């Protein structure tokens, strides 16, 4: 099994962000990716990944008010994985590969092809997009991150534009935008990481609270979902073959 460890946060207690790529144990197997609800651990990541790799996964496709969902079961957990959610539900459209299909309401064993563990800061130092929608007043502009990938098989470039937040900008600040797209903000976008979680997850390190980072807790990790953009993709194919090559941004007047 292929394993991946990315120590974005290098403190002893951290938030584990775990994603498995799996394959139905059957002829004509469905292929799908499962991300586990975040949980805190204190076992060093290079040891925790060995435990994560040894679990057994079963899935069941079900119908919910939101549409098709996958019920996930994780067992064969070792003692440290008491820490880890073992029953939970994820979106089937994101999780399942293009052309991959599961019968409904049948508990289905899956073989693990790969396991990725990303270490993030503690939950109180994580900021979401939803968190920030409650932090603006009559905004004037949208901030979008432009996530650039190269498909290493085809050489094709791919841009995924992901919404970050809306803000209000003073007219005088528009001349250079320097009070909004501060040096801190620009460097944080340039150096942002995209890792295998929620399909893909953009992680921006918020180094202070000025301008485009206003009302964010300093030294937070601002995490952003890309999986909604991967519904029609195979997530395992994407995390194997889409090389993250750059992150840019756009500040757009709102519509």
Which SS3 state, helix, strand or coil, does residue 188 take? helix
For residue 225, state whether it binds a copy of itself (rule: CB under 8 A): yes
Question: How crowded is residue 224: how many other Cβ atoms within 10 Å of its Cβ?
Answer: 21
- The residue range among 78-86, 110-118, 206-214, 225-233 that interacts with a copy of itself, by the rule CB under 8 A, is 225-233
For residue 50, state whether it binds a copy of itself (rule: CB under 8 A): no
C-alpha to C-alpha distance for 222 and 204, rounded to whole angstroms: 5
Give yes or no for a contact between 29 and 23, defined as CB atoms under 8 angstroms apart.
Answer: yes
Q: Which residue in the block uniquely carries the two structure tokens 């194997």?
A: 240
Complex with a copy of itself: residue 10 or 104, whichever CB lies closer: 104
For residue 111, state whether it binds a copy of itself (rule: CB under 8 A): no
Given 65, 138, 155, 175, the residue binding a copy of itself (CB under 8 A): 65
C-alpha to C-alpha distance for 127 and 218, rounded to whole angstroms: 10
For residue 253, state whether it binds a copy of itself (rule: CB under 8 A): no
Q: For residue 49, which of 102, 105, 3 has the smallest C-alpha distance? A: 3
Q: How far is the CB of 132 from a copy of itself (least distance, A)?
A: 9
Complex with a copy of itself: residue 16 or 32, whichever CB lies closer: 32
Tokens of 16: 């584990």
C-alpha to C-alpha distance for 1 and 112, rounded to whole angstroms: 7
For residue 53, state whether it binds a copy of itself (rule: CB under 8 A): no
Complex with a copy of itself: residue 184 or 233, whichever CB lies closer: 233
For residue 86, state whether it binds a copy of itself (rule: CB under 8 A): no
- The residue range among 39-47, 207-215, 227-235, 236-244 that interacts with a copy of itself, by the rule CB under 8 A, is 227-235
HSE-CB at 98 with a 13 A cutoff on CA atoms is 9
C-alpha to C-alpha distance for 29 and 22, rounded to whole angstroms: 10
For residue 252, state whether it binds a copy of itself (rule: CB under 8 A): yes
C-alpha to C-alpha distance for 146 and 193, rounded to whole angstroms: 12
Terminus-to-terminus CA distance in the chain, angstroms? 47
Complex with a copy of itself: residue 130 or 170, whichever CB lies closer: 130
For residue 157, state whether it binds a copy of itself (rule: CB under 8 A): no
For residue 63, state whether it binds a copy of itself (rule: CB under 8 A): yes
Q: Which residue in the block uniquely carries the two structure tokens 């119908």?
A: 63
Complex with a copy of itself: residue 125 or 146, whichever CB lies closer: 146
Complex with a copy of itself: residue 70 or 119, whichever CB lies closer: 70
Residues that bind a copy of itself (CB under 8 A): 62-68, 71, 93, 98, 104-105, 129-130, 133, 144, 161-163, 225, 228-229, 231-232, 252, 255
């Amino acid at each position: 099994m292929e394993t991946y460890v990315n120590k974005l946060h290098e403190g002893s207690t951290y938030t584990a962000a775990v994603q498995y790529n799996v394959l139905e144990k059957d002829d004509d197997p469905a292929s799908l990716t499962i991300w586990v609800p975040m949980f805190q651990s204190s076992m060093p990541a290079d040891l925790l990944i060995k435990e994560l790799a040894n679990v057994n996964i079963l899935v069941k496709q079900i119908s919910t008010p939101k549409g098709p969902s996958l019920r996930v079961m994780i067992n064969s957990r070792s003692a440290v994985l008491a820490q880890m959610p073992s029953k939970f539900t994820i979106c089937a459209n994101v999780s399942l590969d293009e052309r991959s299909k599961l019968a409904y309401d049948v508990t289905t064993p899956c073989e693990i092809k790969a396991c990725s563990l990303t270490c993030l800061k503690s939950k109180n130092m994580l900021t979401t997009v939803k968190d920030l929608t409650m932090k603006t007043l009559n905004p004037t502009h949208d901030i979008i991150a432009l996530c650039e990938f190269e498909n290493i098989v085809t050489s094709k470039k791919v841009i995924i534009p992901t919404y970050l937040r809306s803000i209000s900008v003073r007219n005088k600040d528009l001349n250079t935008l320097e009070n909004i797209t501060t040096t801190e903000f620009k460097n944080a976008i340039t150096n942002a990481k995209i890792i295998p979680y929620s399909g893909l997850l953009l992680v921006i390190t918020v180094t202070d609270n000025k301008g485009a980072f206003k009302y964010i807790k300093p030294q937070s990790q601002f995490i952003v979902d890309l999986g909604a953009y991967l519904e029609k993709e195979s997530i395992y194919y994407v995390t194997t073959n889409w090389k993250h090559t750059a992150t840019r941004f756009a500040i757009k007047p709102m519509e």
